[PDB]
Design a protein around this ligand. Sequence first.
Ligand SMILES: Nc1ncnc2c1ncn2[C@@H]1O[C@H](COP(=O)(O)OP(=O)(O)OC[C@H]2O[C@H](O)[C@H](O)[C@@H]2O)[C@@H](O)[C@H]1O
Ligand SMILES: Nc1ncnc2c1ncn2[C@@H]1O[C@H](COP(=O)(O)OP(=O)(O)OC[C@H]2O[C@H](O)[C@H](O)[C@@H]2O)[C@@H](O)[C@H]1O
Lengths: 176, 176
Amino acid sequence: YFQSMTAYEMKIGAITFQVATGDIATEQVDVIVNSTARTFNRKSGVSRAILEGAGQAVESECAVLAAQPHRDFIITPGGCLKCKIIIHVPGGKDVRKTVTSVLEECEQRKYTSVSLPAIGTGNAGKNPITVADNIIDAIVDFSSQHSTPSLKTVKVVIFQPELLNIFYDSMKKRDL
Amino acid sequence: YFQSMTAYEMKIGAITFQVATGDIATEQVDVIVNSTARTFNRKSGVSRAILEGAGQAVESECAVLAAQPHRDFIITPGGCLKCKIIIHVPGGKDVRKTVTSVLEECEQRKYTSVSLPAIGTGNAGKNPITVADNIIDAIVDFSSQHSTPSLKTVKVVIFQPELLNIFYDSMKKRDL
Ligand SMILES: Nc1ncnc2c1ncn2[C@@H]1O[C@H](COP(=O)(O)OP(=O)(O)OC[C@H]2O[C@H](O)[C@H](O)[C@@H]2O)[C@@H](O)[C@H]1O
Ligand SMILES: Nc1ncnc2c1ncn2[C@@H]1O[C@H](COP(=O)(O)OP(=O)(O)OC[C@H]2O[C@H](O)[C@H](O)[C@@H]2O)[C@@H](O)[C@H]1O
C-alpha cells in the first residue's frame, strides 16, 4: 500500500502540457525524445530505456547519422517503440533551445503528440528547477507563436518522482 | 490565448484518483454520479447537465424510483450518456458517507471507473475545502479496505475552475 501524486496537466493556448511519472519507453505517441551524449553514443539512463525498447536497427541508424554531418539533433524512426520517430538530443546543451527545436520539428512534420524526459537532469548534471523552467519557457513560446498547431499534446515523463513536484512548482507560476 | 491548470492525478493504493476541469456529461466511464435534491426532483447545476444529456427515459425512471421506497440514493441506467448507470445522490447529505456508498456500489457491481462532481458545493452550499477532504477521506478508506478492486479509476469533474486548486491542496496532504 502507498499514496502519491503521479500527474499534473495544464493548458497553454491550444497545447495540453502534461508532466507524469513513468518510463518513457512505454509511450504511445507520435514523437519520443531521447536525451543523450553530443556524439549520440550513450546507452545509460533514459537512452538505455529508449535504445533497448527501440531495437538494434534504430541503434545502428544512430551510428550512421552520428558519423555524418548533422544538426544538433538526429532523427530516426521508432523501431519497436510505439512511436513514429525518435529525436535524439544532447542533454548537455541549452534545454530551452533544444525543446524549441523539437517542437518546431514536430509541427513541421504535422505530428500531434510528443513525450520527452527531464532533459539534462541525470548524467548531464543540470539543475532540475532550471530545466523545468526552460522546458516550460519553450512550450509557452511555441504556443504563443502558433494559434492552431498540429502539435496539441506535450508530455514530460518523469522517472525520479522527486522531480514531479519541481515540475509542478514551475507550472503553477503560469496558472490563472 | 490563455494559461491554466486543468488536471491533477494521484495513486492511492490500487486506485487512480483524478481531479480535472470539465462537464461531467461528456464522461465516458462505467458510472456517473448526479448530485441532486433529497427528492431527486432537481434539474439545475450538475443535475441539468446530467438529466438533459441522459434523456427523458432516465428522467421518468427517476420519478418512479423516487416515489417508492429507496436507499439514500437511486440508480438508473445512463440513457444517452456514455455510461452504464447513473447514481443519484443527495448533495445535502454527509459527503464522505455518500461517496463511500457510491464506491461500494461500484465495486459490488464490478464496475471499473466512476466520475462524480464536487458534491454539495453548489446549491447545497457546503464548504468546498471540507467537501474535497471528505471525498478524499472516502477514497483512502475504500482503498485501504480493498487491495485488489475492480474499481480502479475515480474522477472528480470540476466545473468551477476555482475549486481545482482547493482539490489539489487536499490531495497534496496525502503525498509522499
Ligand atoms: N525510462 C526512463 N523514462 C523517462 N525518464 C528516464 C528514464 N530513465 C531515466 N530517466 C530520467 O532521464 C533524465 C535524464 O537522465 P540521463 O539519461 O542521465 O540523461 P541526461 O540528459 O542527464 O544526460 C545525457 C548526456 O547528456 C550530457 O551530455 C551528459 O554527457 C550525459 O551523458 C533523468 O531525470 C533520469 O532519471
Ligand atoms: N456540467 C457540470 N459538470 C460537472 N460539475 C458541474 C456541472 N455543472 C455544475 N457543476 C458543479 O456541480 C457542483 C454541485 O452543484 P449543484 O448542482 O448546485 O449540486 P449541489 O450538490 O450543490 O446541490 C444539489 C442539491 O442538494 C442539496 O440538497 C441542495 O438542496 C441542492 O439543491 C458545483 O460545483 C457545480 O459548479
